[PDB]
Amino acid sequence: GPIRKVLLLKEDHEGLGISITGGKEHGVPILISEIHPGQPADRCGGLHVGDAILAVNGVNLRDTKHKEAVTILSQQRGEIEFEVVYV
């Protein structure tokens, strides 16, 4: 599908509200495997299971290993911009 830019708002007491799988060491993108109900990704409205996370706040995640992506994603705070695509 089309590449999309999606905005997510989150306080500091919460996580993103997603589960991710995949990563460069597995030969696949960072993929959203769960959107947890009522948490920030769900509330944002624009992120869905099956989306590949291409970048977050301008940080490319297309060639990142799983745990690299966890560190990068969990560091983001407040108003967080995602670039995603559903294939």
Binding site: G15, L16, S19, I20, S33, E34, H66, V70, L73
Partner: peptide
Amino acid sequence: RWPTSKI
């Protein structure tokens, strides 16, 4: 086969 992390 792939890992999953809740974040």
